[PDB]
Design an enzyme around this catalytic site. Structure first.
Site, PDB file in Angstrom:
ATOM      1  N   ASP B 258       0.787  -1.245   0.000  1.00  9.67           N
ATOM      2  CA  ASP B 258       0.000   0.000   0.000  1.00  9.67           C
ATOM      3  C   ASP B 258       0.815   1.290   0.000  1.00  9.67           C
ATOM      4  N   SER B 283       2.166   7.040   0.367  1.00 15.34           N
ATOM      5  CA  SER B 283       1.276   6.090   1.020  1.00 15.34           C
ATOM      6  C   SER B 283      -0.134   6.240   0.473  1.00 15.34           C
ATOM      7  N   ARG B 284      -0.769   5.136   0.086  1.00  5.74           N
ATOM      8  CA  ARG B 284      -2.117   5.161  -0.483  1.00  5.74           C
ATOM      9  C   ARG B 284      -3.211   5.342   0.565  1.00  5.74           C
ATOM     10  N   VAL B 285      -2.934   5.067   1.836  1.00  4.85           N
ATOM     11  CA  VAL B 285      -3.910   5.283   2.908  1.00  4.85           C
ATOM     12  C   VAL B 285      -4.055   6.767   3.216  1.00  4.85           C
ATOM     13  N   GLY B 286      -2.937   7.486   3.277  1.00  5.15           N
ATOM     14  CA  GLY B 286      -2.922   8.942   3.418  1.00  5.15           C
ATOM     15  C   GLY B 286      -3.485   9.433   4.750  1.00  5.15           C
TER      16      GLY B 286
END
Lengths: 50, 365, 516, 50, 97, 464, 464
Positions: B258, B283-286
């Site tokens: 991720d 980061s894709r969660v952010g």
């Protein structure tokens, strides 16, 4: 002229559709006749002799 | 023949122990009170069982928590060259959790597994001593497959670390897994597969090496409340040859994970320690992994560092530069100093927010 | 109208003509099948590269004949094959039906119709692997194949029996240039003499079905479908079809060629045939050479392109012209397949994508394109008027690259730079707009003789298009004189200059100015 | 061109109705003949005058 | 044979044994299929024709089946004669324009 | 008693023979194809013995229509070619069938194509400089009379133009007899050459062998050995001096690759055959000027993908006395013949053979072009203006020397329409000595393209 | 009649059948795993026939716990997936088994995933532009009905918002439905998508197919064909337009390469499967329009190492007609949907296919945005006061054109409560023609954000 060429194309496509529908019916009926002829062993043994 | 597929014992008695991949005690402190036994290859939690990531994994690293946040349930890749600090970042991440573990609340107590694949024995002893100095050996389990061990143990070590971890995850605990490192995992599985005369593909790897890493990593998840709301966070490490990221294993693990913290040896030498390449790591969660007090501060930080990296060439000619951007250059240089950090000194969230406040609100200028 | 007599007569002809030869023949069985190849046991009598047939109505090519079994590649839907199926011999070496009945039809590589229009009234069959005409049977290329693209017919003329490589990048107009060339022939086809009556074959390898359909429509709308046949191997079918599609295209062509007809072949595109042969070879487990290609891809593309020639009058004066297209990975003209095909063909028209996006269309890279036949196939009017243009444009391109940052320069450089900018503006034209050669010569005369030297660069394409319609409405004797003698005589040239001056003396410039 | 394009569509649709009506007559007549032709095909298959 | 099969398939093994047996007898074998068993004079005629279509005397094995409604098919070595009337029907069906 | 075909794979055919009647290697065998319009008699060459009386053969025709179990007869000798003075004038294929007159030469003396090279005791190194009248060649790569000469380069840079130029420079006036061996070049050039040698009347004094790209790899590799057998007959039996032009000899090594992978030998390097250097060596050593007689051979060599580290170019470089090397980059500049001055070399370019006045000029030219080719990396970013005066002086004349190595060749007249030019060695030495010292530095670079000699330089520079 | 498992090697399984009952290739076979902790029904796909009645298979699920000599039952068809209106608003694996509610949809009609593309006579003979009703899409990069569109971007670039937008657009404007193909998607991102589409309440019209990364490469390959077989039913039988998302088509290529390696087939350039262009062509050609109905596709496409010469993207970019790139530098300005107007491109944007005025206005807007993009460095370093007046008047328009590409898109209606707009094409090509001529320059930048249509600009200008 291209319209008239396409008229003749539709004409040919109809003749082919009629021709193939006729041919399919000729074979369909011919399978009935063959099965009706091949109904006794006299025809079996004559056919093996031929 | 034994009557069962590969299983490892699991339980709480593994905390503060060192074990080989079969769950046998390797430290010699005594036998392990195995609580239950799990197969190595149970099904991961399916797409209906999960929940969205929405809780921080406080790393205690300013250059991570302010810019590439890790939420408990994320799979974050610590990809770097050798001797760039990957082991140090993950040891800091494990040490930081002590501030939570001393509280009794199971909703806060992150348990930790460090899985060492193909390390030399003294390096595992060094890491154990580093965690003992920090008191982390109260709540961390080390799985040791040192380089002396046959390829079969190196190949199993990540799976047994995940299998010990899942027992805690399904009981509604929070778990952190560090794999150090999946490049020697892939090299062990290539050794085994070639000896078995299986067909080789690209970079001599067997066909299924993506599936080997994927069926490991996708077992990290956050479970829904119907399964007790436990979670597991994976920090796979990988080592990249000459900073390439187009090699087979890097490409697979970058596509699986991720978020990707690139560590670069050039930034390491230029003094930026830890060497997080904040210009390429993502980061894709952010924001969903950060606390509100961190969003309120870090929001402009990535933009300030991007403007500083653009302006950097003009440092030689800063007299001729317009003042309205001379200030951006001087801010950026102070933010780059503000993001440095000594090893083994993780900062709690309430201290790093104040650290980032100093820079972002301009008091440091 | 239609009549019942024709349909009844066709069925009665089939019925009366039906008989069975009752012939004795070897039947084999499939012992292995996979991924578009199958192994057959039995067939003691099978010839190498005999066309096999399989129970699903599927064909195969017997490539490898081992001591126990025959390795057959499968053509078409190999999904229908399974172990223990019987296979039978067609009795024919690998061949396609051929004849005039293919004109205006779309067929798959086997010479089966794919348009659904009807069966093919084939004249005979031709084997694909018949050798090309030897060094004694050929003649020198000496006859123009007019493409109707100013950029090409001026600098890189195509002669009948040339192979001209249309190498380019992805999405640069390679297919547009070949369709333009096939369209331009209609002005000739309407004459009855086989000598001028060029007929064409377009073979699509690995194209999208929509792109093949779009080409079929563009050729119908132009009237080119009177004389074009399309071999279609679209990207959806098996590797064996993509591999055969050039060969069958050439075989349909050669039957007309050896009769003394003139033939045009477009291979679109010959890189995807090389990739299909790479598939078929690696599934056969032959070891790869360079760029994973098998050792013999040169013997694939040469065996193909060497069929295209002009025959000697002793063999009938027929000829076949090949336009193989190649796709270049980011313009690396030193890649394996590009250099293999450049080593075979008699020249190339490299199309550069960096120019195409600026609106230079066709994007002919004048600095790298060549014709190694050269002016031998170019009509004497065009040869005289255009023969300088090439080098003048190349030195304009290097001069522009130098002068792009020169603050000031000599008058000889500035005059050459303005001439070259006006000549580049002259050479472009819109899509599907084939210009007859009698007009191409005049369009290039305007440039090379400096009659454009009054005109601002933004006016030039308008000016040239309008002036050709001026001379088409009045003073037609210019175009008649040029066409009927293939040379631009002085007594016509003075009338041309007089029409040029009379037009410039009435020319409103697009900037609102006016000039003389 | 637009006027001639419309006239082509009128002519193509004019032929579409004409040809389809003619084909329904043609198909009827051939149903009589196909029973005769099919009996010839059966004799060709068998080799005997069924 | 079944004591030493070593990797061959049992049905092909016993068929190969029958083919060895007849070969030692100095003849060959053909498989024949038809809708009805031929008369004894018919079998002697059949043998008399196959002895002119091949050099060795061709023995026969008859696999009667109602699929081949008329005629017969002969299989010998790996060559076949497609003499069945049902094959004529399939030919006349597929051959059609 | 004779053999039977048992396996067929592409142009490779395995045949079984009776226990005692196995043919020796390189014997020719016959086989029949009887299908129809494809029918022909196959010729096979025996390449391996597989054991158990089985041999594996390379076909000299397309195997298409060959069926397993056909009879093959052993002729008991290798492939033979007609040799004799009556060979000159005519066109032949690899098998010695005349293409111009189908019956011709059937009655001549026939030699086996497969032969040993000359004994080392009979070799002697040649040193006599050949003058071609090309500036770049006569200056920087002086060719050797009775040596081996080669033209390298990627596709579409000038092999065929420069080869037909060399035919016009040498074979048009050479007193001895020429052979030409078309191995695996495009058939259209074979016909253009056959017509041109009749126009120039030279054909009556030369034999042509052809083996163009359509032919299967078995014959495509054997064509070079066929034409070489006629050349070494002219050398050894008639005692004439011979010119042996070969184009394109990389196609020989490539056909060797195709047959070798079909023979089922393991792949080497970029998937060439093993034995590559042995096969190339066996062809090349036969082309040598033994003591008291001479065979001036000129060979074209393709380079795939411009990759001058490819095993085939890399192996052939060892066999050559002067190696002109062409380049894409130099071609793009509009220089022709596009000879790369720095890569190309000649072994006789030394002060003892060519004299000091030639050698000193050649070394000064190479030094200038080398310093320019080093400054190229800065020139590409900052332009000329950044360079120090000692370097900018050099680059200004480097660009002039480079353009001046171009020439309007006699061959290119059919394309450009400009006539051809021949300059003598002495005028070349004088011009480059003046250029390196600077006596032309004041002229514009554009004046120097496609000139020829110093008076033609002046004439051009006056018009500008 | 049942077969036996005879060999197991990783995901690959060989089965032996009775002599007469060998299954046709690409049939689905079922096998059991009986061990208590790993109890499964295991689905095999038939890949090859090895002779001796042995069939080579690849497993759609992990082979762990499988035992030699277990029974294998052929299903007698290809892998089949449920089709019908009741597929909408559910999540399926590649094998057509539902993940949201197990056992759902067993009663539906099932179709073979392996079916042929349309016949040649049925393809539409010309491309039609899709009027999607988004300003930036319609003007700068028009979509092709039944074409394929590449999409580039990532997290924090609105990508899921654009997906929800396009789903709403197809449902409301064309009366169609969407299918989403998670080709190798992250299970976390698959759950985030499922919850996002449920919270937007668009899931009622979307069928979801996930081939998760957790499962072996046979499933990550077949998932795209499964989703395409649902879409083919909606096109052909329901007579609706369909929009097919694929995320990510690079993983379809990769999964294919890995299966090919497990089957032991020899790998080609950079290690892909040797069938690559046909493996891909048999997917991409099947997405098309016929008989007046159409399957439009959006495809996210990863590029390895960012080079558009690698066979994976070089193959993929042969098929697709348009390219939308999303840019974080545009998203950070607040411009939604953040489609980069300079880096995105389309191939239908030609004066022959769209009106000459559309092409002119698109070329002018590209020119103005390109000028502003070239000036942005001077602006950032030196400030607007360092500009001339002629270019500052250009930047005054470029700022407004850049804002006016933004739209109040229907996906935002969840948050803003204001409805989404759908501008006609004949409106947007007037609005940008006026705006490039500067008629609106007296309005502030805030008047153009999120605005929608030109009459809305007239309202918002009088509100401000």
């Amino acid at each position: 002229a291209q319209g008239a060429q396409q008229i003749q194309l539709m004409r040919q496509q109809l003749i082919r559709q009629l021709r193939t529908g006729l041919g399919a019916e000729a074979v369909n009926k011919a399978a009935e006749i063959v099965r009706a002829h091949v109904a006794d062993p006299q025809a079996q043994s004559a056919t093996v002799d031929r | 023949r034994t009557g069962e597929v590969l299983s490892v014992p699991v339980g709480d008695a593994f905390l503060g122990r060192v074990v080989n991949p079969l769950g046998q005690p390797i430290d010699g402190q005594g036998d392990i009170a195995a609580e239950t036994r799990r197969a190595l290859e149970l099904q991961a939690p399916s797409v209906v069982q999960r929940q969205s990531v929405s809780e921080p994994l406080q790393t205690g690293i300013k250059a991570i928590d302010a810019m590439t946040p890790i939420g408990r349930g994320q799979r974050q890749l610590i990809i770097g060259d050798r001797k760039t600090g990957k082991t140090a970042v993950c040891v800091d991440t494990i040490l930081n959790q002590r501030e939570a573990w001393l509280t009794g609340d199971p909703k806060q107590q992150v348990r930790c597994v460090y899985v060492a694949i193909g390390q030399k024995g003294t390096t595992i002893a060094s890491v154990k001593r580093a965690l003992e100095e920090g008191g982390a050996m109260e709540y961390t389990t080390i799985v040791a497959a040192p380089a002396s061990d046959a390829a079969g143990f190196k190949w199993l070590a990540p799976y047994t670390g995940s299998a010990i971890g899942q027992h805690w995850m399904y009981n509604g605990k929070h778990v952190l897994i560090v794999f150090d490192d999946l490049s020697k995992q892939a090299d062990a599985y290539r050794a085994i597969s070639l000896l078995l005369r299986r067909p080789p593909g690209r970079e001599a790897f067997p066909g299924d090496v993506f599936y080997l890493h994927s069926r490991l990593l996708e077992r990290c998840a956050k479970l829904s409340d119907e399964l007790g709301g436990g979670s597991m966070t994976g920090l796979p490490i990988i080592e990249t040859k000459a900073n390439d990221i187009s090699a087979f294993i890097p490409t697979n693990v970058i596509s699986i994970t991720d978020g990707q913290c690139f560590l670069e040896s050039d930034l390491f030498n230029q003094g930026v320690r830890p060497a997080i390449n904040v210009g390429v790591s993502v980061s894709r969660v952010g924001g969903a992994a950060q606390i509100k007090a961190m969003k309120e501060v870090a929001g402009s930080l990535r933009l300030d560092l991007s403007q500083y990296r653009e302006l950097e060439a003009f440092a030689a000619f800063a007299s001729d530069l317009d003042a309205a951007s001379k200030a951006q250059l001087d801010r950026g240089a102070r933010l780059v100093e503000l993001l440095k950090q000594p090893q083994y000194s993780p900062l709690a969230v309430e201290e790093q927010v104040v650290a980032i406040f100093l820079g972002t609100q301009g008091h440091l200028d | 109208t239609i009549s019942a007599a024709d349909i009844e007569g066709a069925i009665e002809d089939y019925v009366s003509s039906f008989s069975a030869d009752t012939e004795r023949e070897e039947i084999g069985t499939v012992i292995d099948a996979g991924d578009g190849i199958a192994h057959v046991e039995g067939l003691p009598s099978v010839m190498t590269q005999e066309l096999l047939e399989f129970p699903g109505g599927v064909l195969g090519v017997a490539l490898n004949l081992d001591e126990h079994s025959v390795g057959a590649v499968i053509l078409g839907e190999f999904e229908k094959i399974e172990e223990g199926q019987q296979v039978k011999r067609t009795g024919e070496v690998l061949s396609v039906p051929v004849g005039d009945a293919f004109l205006g039809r779309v067929v798959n590589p086997l010479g089966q119709p794919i348009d659904g229009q009807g069966d093919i009234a084939a004249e005979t069959r031709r084997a694909l692997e018949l050798q090309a005409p030897s060094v004694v049977q050929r003649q020198s290329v000496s006859e123009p194949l007019q493409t109707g693209i100013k950029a090409i017919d001026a600098m890189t003329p195509i002669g009948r029996g040339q192979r001209q490589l249309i190498i380019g990048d992805r999405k640069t107009g390679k297919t547009a240039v070949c369709v333009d060339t096939i369209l331009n022939q209609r002005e000739a086809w309407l004459t009855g003499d086989p000598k001028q009556q060029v007929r064409c074959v377009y073979v699509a390898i690995g194209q999208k079905g929509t792109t093949i359909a779009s080409v079929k429509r563009a050729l119908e709308e132009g009237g080119a479908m009177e004389y074009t046949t399309i071999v279609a191997a679209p990207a959806s079918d098996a590797a064996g079809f993509k591999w055969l599609a050039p060969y069958t295209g050439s075989a349909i062509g050669q039957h007309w060629m050896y009769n003394g007809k003139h033939v045009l072949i477009v291979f679109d595109d010959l890189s995807k045939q090389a990739d299909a042969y790479r598939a078929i070879s690696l599934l056969l487990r032959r070891p790869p050479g360079r760029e994973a290609f098998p050792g013999d891809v040169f013997y694939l593309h040469s065996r193909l392109l060497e069929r295209c020639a002009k025959l000697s009058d002793e063999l009938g004066g027929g000829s076949m012209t090949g336009l193989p297209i190649i796709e270049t990975k980011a313009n690396d003209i030193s890649a394996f397949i590009p250099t293999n095909v450049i080593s075979i063909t008699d020249g190339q028209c490299f199309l550069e994508s960096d120019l195409f996006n600026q609106g230079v269309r066709p994007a002919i890279n004048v600095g790298v394109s060549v014709s190694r036949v050269g002016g031998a196939a170019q009509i004497k009017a065009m040869k005289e008027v255009a023969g300088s243009l090439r080098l003048d444009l190349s030195q304009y391109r290097e001069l522009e690259a130098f002068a792009a940052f020169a603050s000031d320069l000599d008058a000889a450089s500035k005059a050459q730079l303005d001439r070259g900018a006006r000549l580049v503006e002259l050479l472009k034209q819109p899509q599907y707009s084939p210009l007859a050669v009698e007009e191409q010569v005049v369009a290039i005369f305007l440039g090379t003789q400096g009659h454009l030297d009054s005109v601002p660069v933004e006016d030039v394409q308008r000016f040239e298009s309008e002036l050709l319609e001026h001379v088409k409405a009045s003073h037609s004797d210019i175009f008649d004189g040029i066409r009927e003698t293939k040379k631009l005589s002085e007594e016509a040239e003075e009338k041309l200059v007089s029409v040029i001056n009379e037009f410039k003396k009435g020319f409103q410039a697009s900037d609102g100015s006016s000039v003389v | 061109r637009a006027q001639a394009s419309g006239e082509v569509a009128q002519t193509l649709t004019q032929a579409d109705q004409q040809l389809s009506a003619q084909g329904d007559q043609v198909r009827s007549g051939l149903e009589s003949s196909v029973d005769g032709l099919s009996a010839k095909l059966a004799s060709r298959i068998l080799g005997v005058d069924v | 044979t079944v004591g030493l099969l070593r990797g061959e398939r049992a049905d092909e093994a016993v068929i190969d044994l029958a083919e060895l047996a007849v070969s030692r007898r100095g003849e060959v074998v053909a498989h024949v299929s038809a809708a009805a068993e031929l008369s004894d004079a018919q079998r002697t005629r059949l043998t008399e024709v196959l002895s002119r279509i091949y050099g060795r005397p061709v023995s026969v094995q008859l696999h009667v089946d109602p699929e081949l409604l008329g005629g017969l098919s002969i299989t010998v070595g790996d060559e076949v004669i497609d003499g069945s009337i049902a094959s004529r029907l399939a030919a006349a069906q597929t051959g059609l324009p | 008693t004779a053999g039977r075909v048992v396996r067929i794979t592409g142009p490779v055919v395995d045949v079984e023979f009776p226990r005692g009647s196995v043919p020796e290697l390189f014997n020719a065998l016959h086989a029949e194809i009887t299908f129809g319009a494809l029918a022909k008699t196959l010729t096979l060459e025996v390449a391996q013995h597989l054991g158990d009386s089985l041999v594996r053969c390379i076909s000299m025709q397309p195997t298409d229509g060959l069926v397993r179990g056909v009879e093959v007869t052993d002729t008991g000798a290798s492939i033979s070619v007609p040799v004799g003075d009556g060979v000159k004038g005519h066109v032949f294929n690899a098998l010695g069938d005349c293409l111009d007159d189908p019956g011709y030469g059937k009655d001549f003396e026939h030699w086996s194509i497969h032969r040993k090279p000359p004994a080392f005791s009979d070799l002697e190194p040649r040193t006599e400089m050949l003058e071609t009248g090309l500036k770049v060649v006569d200056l920087l790569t002086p060719y050797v009379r009775g040596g081996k000469i080669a033209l390298f380069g990627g596709a579409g840079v000038g092999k065929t133009v420069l080869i037909q130029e060399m035919i016009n420079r040498i074979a048009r006036n050479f007193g001895g007899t020429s052979v030409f061996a078309g191995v695996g070049e495009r058939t259209r050039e074979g016909n253009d050459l056959w017509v041109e040698l009749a126009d120039a009347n030279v054909l009556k004094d030369t034999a042509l062998v052809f083996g163009q790209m359509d032919e299967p790899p078995g014959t495509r590799m054997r064509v070079a050995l066929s034409a070489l057998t006629m050349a070494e007959f002219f050398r050894d039996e008639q005692g004439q001096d011979v010119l042996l032009f070969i184009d394109n000899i990389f196609r020989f090594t490539q056909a060797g690759s195709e047959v070798s992978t079909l023979l089922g030998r393991m792949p080497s390097a970029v998937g060439y055959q093993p034995t590559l250097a042995d096969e190339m060596g066996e062809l090349q050593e036969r082309i040598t000027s033994t003591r008291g007689r001479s065979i001036t051979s000129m060979q074209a060599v393709y380079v795939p993908a411009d990759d001058y580290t490819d095993p085939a170019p890399a192996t052939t470089f060892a066999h050559l006395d002067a190696t002109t090397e062409l380049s894409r980059a130099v071609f793009s500049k509009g220089i022709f013949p596009a000879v790369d001055p720095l890569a190309s070399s000649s072994t006789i370019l030394d002060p003892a053979i060519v004299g000091d006045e030639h050698y000193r000029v050649a070394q000064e030219v190479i030094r200038i072009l080398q310093r320019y080719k080093d400054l190229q990396d800065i020139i590409a970013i900052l332009g000329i203006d950044e360079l120090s005066e000692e370097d900018k002086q050099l680059v200004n004349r480097a660009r002039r020397i480079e353009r001046f190595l171009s020439q309007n060749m006699m061959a290119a007249e059919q394309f450009t329409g400009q006539p051809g030019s021949t300059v003598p060695l002495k005028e070349t030495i004088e011009a480059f000595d003046k250029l390196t010292k600077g006596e032309f530095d004041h002229l514009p670079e554009q004046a120097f393209f496609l000139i020829g000699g110093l008076d033609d330089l002046a004439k051009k520079a006056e018009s500008l």
